[PDB]
Amino acid sequence: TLLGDERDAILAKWNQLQAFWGTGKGYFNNNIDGLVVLVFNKKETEIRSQQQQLVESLHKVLGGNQTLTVNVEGTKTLPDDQTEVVIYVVERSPNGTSRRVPATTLYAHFEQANIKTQLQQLGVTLSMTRTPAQIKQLLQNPPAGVDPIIWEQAKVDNPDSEKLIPVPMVGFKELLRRLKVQDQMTKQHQTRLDIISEDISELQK
């Protein structure tokens, strides 16, 4: 029956798997994350308890200088005693320019023997990383299960290549995704703008 395939196509359409994904396909351009996941032997709990320390703690493992800052993305519950903390670190430069430290030269740092030992004292049982030239490094070779000819074309189509790389976006929750980030993003913009505003008030006063 012709009838059953239409049904199949439609089912195909509405799905995260990507067979002509409900024609949900849309690519958003993400500028070019540094995220490291840590498992603690601790309740989710031992964590939200002392969250200050715990990044400080992380901060001083890093060396504990000012041009360095530790940030927490989510904490989730895996089991009765057990927790996943995801963090990224931003690094400041002599001119006051900030960026996140890359996931791999962060992971490289933490795998150290001393640092690993130090992290272990903290309760960290395990860690994982998600991931100039490096752009070139990821943008080619394709992503998530995205087709290679489309992925290409987002690269040519890209309006603003340094500020941006093609990042695969996946149907509605993904837009949800983006929005969550946007908001995430929004608050920090607002704030930094406040910091400039405070400094300007101090100068004027």
Binding site: G171, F172, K173, L175, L176, L179, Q182, D183, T186, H189, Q190, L193
Partner: peptide, 21 residues
Amino acid sequence: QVQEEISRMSSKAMLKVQEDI
């Protein structure tokens, strides 16, 4: 539902920003 969910979620926060900077 998720589509609604995104629909519920929409910007003024964003519009606010350009004005401030």
